[PDB]
Amino acid sequence: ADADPDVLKVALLPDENASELIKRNQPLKDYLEEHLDKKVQLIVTTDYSSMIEAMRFGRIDLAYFGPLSYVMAKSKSDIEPFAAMVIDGKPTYRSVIIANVASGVNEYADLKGKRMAYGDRASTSSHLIPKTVLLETADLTGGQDYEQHFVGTHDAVAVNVANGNADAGGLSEVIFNHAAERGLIDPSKVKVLGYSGEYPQYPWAMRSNLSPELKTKVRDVFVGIDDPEVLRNFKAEAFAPITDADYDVIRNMGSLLGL
């Protein structure tokens, strides 16, 4: 393994259409090349498990993980978290639970016997969080009291609810809120049922066998970002420093999934 590679392989959680993700992250790629003196190669894997496996086998250097996929990768490989974005004045985010207007689902209790869409099994806000909300508020258990279907991206959750393939679904609040704008769905076909509480934001992480000098530089460059052109694509105000213990809440909640 190379401690100080000339090219940095930088993976992005596949929570949306890969072209959308490459587009959104272009200004950050340009900023990193300038301030790190490295070439940057952006990667989007086919699913969450393939990004976790790429990290374990040393095939990527930096990764933008979700909270649950981060704690899963950290259990399998030697990695460290270093930054997360501050969006809307907070270092946290929420899941939204949505329903198709034609399904007969008017509240959480009405999901008994119906079809729920989740994203990836390793998703925080399109699986773990909404599943926990349905259990704690309505005493509903996935696969036992309702059908669960895993459709991949958060984009796919919104599409499958809106077109009638699912009756309800759970996903990231920010991703849902821009789905009509991007032309993914007709917003008249869906309604919001409710929201989760606030959970720690997606962490940036790197393989811990990079050199100490390179790891310090990566952390300093990200936390120092105040360029409006980089921040605007994310609707962010800053990149904040983080530690592994910030994700213990997710570890504890993950006991319900057998982690």
Residue numbers in the entry: 2 to 260
Quote what the paper states about this structure.
Here we elucidate the molecular basis of high-affinity phosphite and hypophosphite acquisition by determining the ligand-binding affinity and structure of the PBPs of phosphite and hypophosphite ABC transporters from environmental microorganisms. We over-produced and purified PBPs of three putative phosphite transporters; PtxB from the globally important marine diazotroph Trichodesmium erythraeum IMS101 (Te_PtxB), PhnD from the oceanic picocyanobacteria Prochlorococcus marinus MIT9301 (Pm_PhnD)35 and PtxB from the soil bacterium Pseudomonas stutzeri WM88 (Ps_PtxB), as well as a PBP from a putative hypophosphite transporter, HtxB, also from P. stutzeri WM88 (HtxB)18. The structures reveal that ligand specificity, measured here by thermophoresis, arises from a combination of steric considerations and the interaction between a ligand P-H hydrogen atom and an aromatic π system in the binding pocket. The structures of two distinct types of phosphite-binding protein and a hypophosphite-binding protein reveal that a P-H…π interaction ensures high-affinity binding of specific ligands, representing a universal mechanism in these PBPs for recognising ligands with a P-H bond.
We also obtained structures of phosphite and MPn complexed Ps_PtxB and determined the associated ligand affinities; both the structures and binding data were similar to the other phosphite-binding proteins discussed previously. Analysis of the conformational change between the open and closed, phosphite-bound structure of Ps_PtxB using DynDom42 revealed that domain closure is induced by a ~60° rotation around an axis that lies between the two lobes. This is facilitated by flexible loops that form the hinge region between the lobes (residues A85-T93 and Y200-Q202), as well as residues from the extreme end of the C-terminal helix (G255-L258). Superposition of the individual lobes of Ps_PtxB in the open and closed conformations shows that lobe 2 (residues 96–196, 0.35 Å RMSD cα) adopts a very similar structure, with the conserved STS-H motif (S124, T125, S126 and H155) spatially conserved in both conformations. The positions of Y94, which hydrogen bonds to one of the phosphite oxygen atoms in the closed structure, and D16, which hydrogen bonds to and stabilises the capping tyrosine in the closed structure, move ~7 Å and ~4.5 Å (cα-cα), respectively, on ligand binding. Y94 resides on the hinge region, the conformation of which alters substantially during domain closure, whilst D16 sits on a flexible loop that latches over the binding pocket in the closed conformation. In addition, the B-factors of the core residues in lobe 2 are much lower in the closed, ligand bound, conformation compared to those in the open structure, implying lower overall flexibility when phosphite is bound to the protein.
